[PDB]
């Protein structure tokens, strides 16, 4: 995760829950319970998309697997993939569906999928993160530590 404009992060929602993973499924949980250790997330810019939309890549596990939006029957779908965030920095058309637009709503942020426009990262109501079409359930916060 040592590249230009490359930083480490932890991702929280409005209620201090942190992104973590269990067997590849992105979930939200209390960082402080020994049950939910948070994903150490690498963030990289996508230099080929419109910078004013803050295009970024999302790399869990220190940047070893990246979050993507895939178009299926059930709709758009979040997927974690065996792709390193440096391969995405190389660029190309294929990196768009690993790209999220980081849209600021004040101090928080929304994460909208570039390959599935109008769809936003969405926290579960009940105790898996998903995609949805301003709400606190689509609001996120980046801490370096």
């Amino acid at each position, epitope marked *: 995760c040592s590249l230009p404009m490359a930083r480490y992060y932890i991702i929280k929602d409005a209620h201090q829950k942190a992104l973590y993973t269990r*067997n590849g499924q992105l979930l939200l949980g209390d960082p402080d319970s020994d049950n939910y250790s948070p994903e*150490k997330v690498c963030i990289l810019p996508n230099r080929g998309l419109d910078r004013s939309k803050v295009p970024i890549f999302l790399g869990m596990q*220190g940047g*070893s*697997c990246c979050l993507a939006c895939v178009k299926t029957r059930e709709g758009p779908l979040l*997927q974690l993939e*065996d792709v*390193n965030i440096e391969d995405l920095y190389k660029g190309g058309e294929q990196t768009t569906r690993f790209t999220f637009f980081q849209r600021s709503l004040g101090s928080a942020f929304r994460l909208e999928a570039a390959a599935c426009p109008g769809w936003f990262l969405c926290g579960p109501a009940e105790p898996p993160v998903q995609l949805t079409k301003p709400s606190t359930h689509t609001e996120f916060y980046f801490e370096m530590s």
Partner: antibody
Amino acid sequence: VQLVESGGGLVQPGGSLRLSCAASGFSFSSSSIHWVRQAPGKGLEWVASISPYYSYTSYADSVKGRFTISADTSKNTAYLQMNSLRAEDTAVYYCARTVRGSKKPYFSGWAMDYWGQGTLVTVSS
Amino acid sequence: IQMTQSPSSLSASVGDRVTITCRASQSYYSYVAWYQQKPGKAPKLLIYSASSLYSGVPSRFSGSRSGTDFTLTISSLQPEDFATYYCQQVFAPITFGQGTKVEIKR
């Protein structure tokens, strides 16, 4: 699901060998292919990985620039091109598969669920 | 990245409880897999994603994490468990543990 390796054998120092990994029962598009090697009496060492779908490849430091992994999605067959072989490359070479996508049915945390029985490579004058 | 495995070898009697420990050198990694390798055989996958049991593997195998320390557990050792066990960091520069030789004590 079946993975079959071929092309192993004896080869002199500095020589070249090409290995083959012929896959069945799964799609190349939905998986990654890996080469892992094991010297007599020693532990597992990863060699290289390729994503056929995205065409990304990774290599262990000890073979970068000598080894090249590739795939032909039409044949569901992966290849290891080995050049400038040395004696310490002597090992059994397995190819193995992982499911790329966390949402795929048989996803297993990117662990190597299927392996071949491996092909022996001897580097020796 | 490193995966330090311990012990390098152990012998234990049938039915005993066996644990093997693998310590990762970075804390952002938690997708550890555990493999069983029998004489002249390809490795066989036991545990994936740190603690999920793979289809078919006997229920007496389990895996757990505590920080950077990953543990495989064989609850009652069986004679067929003679093998070498490896842990694996699954991403990018893939890394194995040095391996643990498990001899059955009779």
